[PDB]
Amino acid sequence: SDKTFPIMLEGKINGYACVVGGKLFRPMHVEGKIDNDVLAALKTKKASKYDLEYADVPQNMRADTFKYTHEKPQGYYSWHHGAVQYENGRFTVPKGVGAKGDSGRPILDNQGRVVAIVLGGVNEGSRTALSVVMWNEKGVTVKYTPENCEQW
Amino acid sequence: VMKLESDKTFPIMLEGKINGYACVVGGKLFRPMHVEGKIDNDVLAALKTKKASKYDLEYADVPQNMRADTFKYTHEKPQGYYSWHHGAVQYENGRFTVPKGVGAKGDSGRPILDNQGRVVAIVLGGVNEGSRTALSVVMWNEKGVTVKYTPENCEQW
Amino acid sequence: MKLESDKTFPIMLEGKINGYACVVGGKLFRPMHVEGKIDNDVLAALKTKKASKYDLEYADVPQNMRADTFKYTHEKPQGYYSWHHGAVQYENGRFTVPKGVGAKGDSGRPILDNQGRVVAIVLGGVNEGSRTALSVVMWNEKGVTVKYTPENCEQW
Numbered sequence: 001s002d003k004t005f006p007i008m009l010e011g012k013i014n015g016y017a018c019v020v021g022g023k024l025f026r027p028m029h030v031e032g033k034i035d036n037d038v039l040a041a042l043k044t045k046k047a048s049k050y051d052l053e054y055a056d057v058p059q060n061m062r063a064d065t066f067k068y069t070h071e072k073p074q075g076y077y078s079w080h081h082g083a084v085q086y087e088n089g090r091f092t093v094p095k096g097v098g099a100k101g102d103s104g105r106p107i108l109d110n111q112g113r114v115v116a117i118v119l120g121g122v123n124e125g126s127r128t129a130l131s132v133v134m135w136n137e138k139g140v141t142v143k144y145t146p147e148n149c150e151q152w
Numbered sequence: 153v154m155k156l157e158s159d160k161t162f163p164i165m166l167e168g169k170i171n172g173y174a175c176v177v178g179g180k181l182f183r184p185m186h187v188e189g190k191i192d193n194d195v196l197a198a199l200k201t202k203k204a205s206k207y208d209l210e211y212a213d214v215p216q217n218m219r220a221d222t223f224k225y226t227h228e229k230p231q232g233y234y235s236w237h238h239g240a241v242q243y244e245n246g247r248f249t250v251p252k253g254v255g256a257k258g259d260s261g262r263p264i265l266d267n268q269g270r271v272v273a274i275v276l277g278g279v280n281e282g283s284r285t286a287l288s289v290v291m292w293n294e295k296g297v298t299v300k301y302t303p304e305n306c307e308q309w
Numbered sequence: 310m311k312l313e314s315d316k317t318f319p320i321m322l323e324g325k326i327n328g329y330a331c332v333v334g335g336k337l338f339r340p341m342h343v344e345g346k347i348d349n350d351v352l353a354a355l356k357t358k359k360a361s362k363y364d365l366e367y368a369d370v371p372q373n374m375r376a377d378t379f380k381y382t383h384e385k386p387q388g389y390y391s392w393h394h395g396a397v398q399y400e401n402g403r404f405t406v407p408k409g410v411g412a413k414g415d416s417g418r419p420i421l422d423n424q425g426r427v428v429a430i431v432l433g434g435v436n437e438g439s440r441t442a443l444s445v446v447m448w449n450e451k452g453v454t455v456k457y458t459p460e461n462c463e464q465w
Contacts, residue, residue: 023156139154
């Protein structure tokens with residue numbers, strides 16, 4: 001794929017950035033440089049209310065980026081660490097899964113479409129509650145953060 | 153298609169300190185006229201502003217590329233609550249109040265929003281009245297006429 | 310959203326606009342020969358003093374308006390200025406506009422420089438062929454009112 005690029009800080013992967021619908025996304029709270037020259041060169045617009053920074057990607061990339069959708073029917077989804085579950089407008093992964101450095105990774109439905117970008121999470125029993133950003137019907141950004149959520 | 157939205161309020165730096173805030177509403181840039189400093193945003197900090205001393209506001213048109221990404225505004229102020237950076241803002245009998253101990257110098261310039269996200273006022277100052285703090289602000293009436301309200305013994309922020 | 314306050318006001322007479330009044334630096338000005346009521350309650354209730362020699366009636370504008378009134382200036386370099394109907398030329402000490410421009414109902418209108426400052430208030434004019442010379446009150450160095458009226462000028 002390679003539509004997700006690790007953000008380097010000091011000397012490690014402090015997070016991830018990704019390209020969706022011709023837009024570059026990056027978690028605001030995640031400091032560091034993207035491991036890609038073009039992307040790391042783009043001036044971003046800060047959206048602190050959603051803990052996101054974004055920028056238009058050059059035309060010679062637009063079509064070759066993640067596709068997105070507001071369609072979030074309850075059920076199962078996927079992401080780098082395995083399966084994700086969506087129920088009651090909340091995304092969750094198995095307990096113990098998800099941690100620092102995972103901010104930025106997207107969540108995908110069967111069709112490989114990005115339905116959300118992860119910002120953080122927190123342990124709730126035998127499940128990990130996720131803080132994410134999504135998109136509604138009108139195409140507006142919506143953010144949902146679980147109680148006592150930790151930033152990854 | 154996507155309809156992203158980014159920050160619409162910016163800190164006004166003065167001598168390396170935050171002295172107020174500027175924001176963009178209805179395709180315009182505003183900043184409290186009594187606040188000294190430079191907008192922490194190159195593009196906006198360079199625009200030429202026109203003064204409106206009657207409202208303690210300085211303003212300028214926002215470029216074509218920024219027009220779609222600015223606060224929408226309204227005159228609609230039914231009684232109840234609204235919100236701003238520091239929390240809930242109550243509006244009753246033509247006056248916006250917040251809890252005592254909330255709001256101080258440095259907050260002038262910040263906007264007050266209704267639940268739909270529209271700006272119903274811009275803060276200019278305040279003064280404590282008992283357990284509440286009455287706010288000085290710029291609002292808009294039905295005709296589109298900019299109106300300013302300043303509480304007795306108000307202090308500029 | 311309206312940020313700028315109106316600084317000119319139509320003078321009504323039998324339903325028709327007979328001229329204009331404007332507010333400059335804390336003062337209302339009105340062409341003395343123009344009869345009618347200023348179309349603004351506050352302004353119309355003001356008592357005015359007359360300066361016949363200048364064909365101007367004037368009063369102190371309410372303090373709550375002083376804040377957004379026209380700023381005047383004496384600086385009148387030759388070139389162009391503007392007024393409601395377009396460009397106004399200034400040369401050889403007199404303002405002129407094109408024929409077909411300037412008529413009854415235009416007295417009281419201001420002429421502004423590009424910085425939005427008032428350099429003159431029109432009181433009338435007279436066509437002189439391809440151009441129409443204007444009658445006006447201006448301001449000199451000491452901020453003193455001065456008047457200029459073309460030969461056979463008519464009070465619009």
